[PDB]
């Protein structure tokens, strides 16, 4: 069965019996100053092409929606804000395609730099709506301000197989093709500046590479849909 | 008996984090340490299993002295008294043994004389934020600093004036988180730590290797 | 004054002591605590989270994602072993750096059972049968599909199920807790065999991959915190 | 005697300790306390008292009473800015040495709202309109009367009212308390513009002056006492 | 949490107000300090936010010694004992190390030997008036003295006789008002303090200056 | 603080003393005790067991 979900002036369709992973057992809620409900809509980013040699993709959350409608408008307008997210990841593949994906949302995914003495620049840390790709090779140290994008360390100097500690969902093409992660607001402060701090990082890493026989489509599109939940910002009026 | 794997029993252990020396005839004979949890790799890794932490600080100081060479015919130095000053974040900081900062009333200080039990002081959670952050994906611009984690600085100096011979003292700072609360588990650090200030790493293998998948 | 007597150990500093200490900043007033999601009360909550097992160590693979991929393909002759590793969570190498292994390597004694999950990541049109065999400690590893079948085993049909979950039993020298590290001791093994070949239709790749996951299943516990051996 | 054990820190002198001390003059008997008017229980009572803001710093004015006088006169073209200063109570310079600023500079963290009062001190026959605009932190200062009007603002008619009171909002990084001193951070500004010229009858001076007052309005609080930077 | 801005939390902080040295072979080797709150500018400014104050006194003394040069073949001085005498207002005052004033029974004194916890004594509100005055617009004639603010004097000397080598000791006096009550708030001091005895000042600007009224 | 006085023998170590001592391993959690047969509560239980007397020393 197919379930159609409409948010604002946007609507998407999902398999009725799809499993949703709630981040830490906590749904997005309001801070127990000024909320916005016109932002409550689905933002379908550009689809990426999962290939045989694909190493992975990642998107920093606040930044990914920085050039999308009122949410971006609110980001430049207000100085402070806080919000949760609902992330939909969908793959369009046939039964003749095989592969396994890890879809994980990492809070405060601070990333290292190829040069041990420096830190990565903003452009390399995030591409906004554009996706950032991991690399199956090791970035050379000569490089001065790029992210060490070796997949098996996930750019954080940890075991990539241990990323399951963070809220995650597996996409096994033979079994399922969609993932839904509900991420609450997680921070050490009640509100924060959205332009200088990326609270969340969504990662999609192929643990089992995509495989197919000659004649089948040589790619599998992956579509990411993000809907901000319970967004609210600081007031701008007097007392 | 899963009691020993709780957060409190996992992190509430005293550890020597810093070690320094200072003599009493140099004008610069004072030891300083900015309080940070990244000094010791073992403690850093244990704290970096989580993203946000909230704890109190218990500090114990082990101070010992040693007689330095002199030419005096006879040396009969009295018992030595040491001053340990805690400078809260934003407080004045000394640059010499004789400096006003040593007398700031808002900089709590402990005066301790040798031969007694080692001095001990406790600092509470002093962040304007609601928790300390071991990881920060953003800018303050410097990436991943989060100045909301400032915990203050410690300073140590001889109180006694120099006698007929120099005295060199060494201080061992013992660090113990108390009433710890942790949030958002994270994967254990796998690559070796390279810098104390950042998370930079050099790519390493996922695990140790065997000959074949069937051993 | 009131007569008192100081017992031995009165002015000593024991690093494990638990005494009231004076506050350097009384009258400070701390920032009230907020409700942050994901509160952790015990490391065993981390130990019970499934993580991917690098079964294919194969040093040409430890610096890639192939370390987690168990190759499966159509072989001419049947009954070969797919994989196998000792059930030593904390010393071997395959389970050393997993979420369970990292927690265990912080302690000297541990107790409980190991939950192993295997996920078939081939095409939806691929069919076949796998024999997953558990060898108790003391007993040797099976050398054939027949020997594996005669012991404790589960027949896994990928055509019917994509995942199989095994909870290996504790079984220890009536010790309740046993050492995380070990020395030439009965280990216990888990192995996989080709019950049948992989049957595939036309225009479908026969070569597939299997993913293994590990986690603590039954009442797991640890004792005697120590230093992890993975830091310098 | 009763067995006791001395814990670490037993003979230490911590400058923030709170212990009973022996009285050097027991049996002295102190002069009974009388009721003196003006008892103070908290420094924040001092912080909530309005004080004159030296808006016109203008170093030729800091050694005079002109530092508090904001000049207003009839200008040929309209829409000029009357004045403007950042809303940094404790670091800027205009609010540094006021009653509120002096109390704040004794602490590192502070919270609450700022009450600004403007008093027109021209003749009773002078009439005009002023636009008082508040720019939230992050947003830049207005460059025109139009931009000021499009934001948060109040139209002040001196012909109808001699005083206007604004309570600027807290608005901080969900920090509850924020640093008294600051570093190239979003500040927030308050500015004034000529909505109309000053209309005056014959034999009445067109040039007038405005006085600004500041005080803590909402639930103000401070934290982490320190040394004031104004003493040598 | 406005608790830290109360009068008690604002003024009840220990501060080093006086520092002096005295040797044991001079006849004049004794340290004196008339108790006054105008010695330290930081404490003076904090107390001068009010007109009338009432508080108790807690004094902690940090005494340390240093060996002075000698010609003795061997120096083996025993542990040193110090005498700290508080002279109430109107009490006899010493002029030498050997003076009757040191033995006055109505002058409370503390005998303390080195190596132990520092000595501590407390003096209550000892004014014939109902409160201390930080400001007095009148004559006693000298303008603005108000002799009702006399708080006594402190004296310090070595108890041990001089041995085979001189010993120089330094004393740090720590001052802490307790149970403070304040009346009649006053504007914070703006000009720099010029004299300890009077309020004299040199005219200074109201605040720091910027370029223009529109920044 | 509370006034106290140290009596003679305050810092001494008497080998027969019975005082509370700090635990070097607090939070260890010991292996629970099992029921082992042959529990001994007094040496006199051993003293009341018959044993063969070497009468013929020789």
Residue numbers in the entry:
A (entry chain 2): 12 to 43, 54 to 260
B (entry chain 1), E (entry chain 1): 58 to 197, 203 to 277
C (entry chain 3), D (entry chain 3): 1 to 232
F (entry chain 3): 1 to 58
Text of the article:
They form an icosahedrally-symmetric capsid of about 30 nm in diameter with VP1 around the 5-fold, VP2 on the sides of the 2-fold and alternating VP2 and VP3 around 3-fold symmetry axes. At the base of VP1, there is a hydrophobic pocket which normally contains a lipid factor. Similar to empty particles, recombinantly produced Virus-Like Particles (VLPs) closely mimic the structure of infectious virions but lack genetic material.
Through cryoEM and single-particle image processing, two distinct particle populations were separated. Unmodelled density shown at threshold of 1.5 σ above mean on the sides of the 2-fold outside the capsid could be flexible VP1 N-terminus.
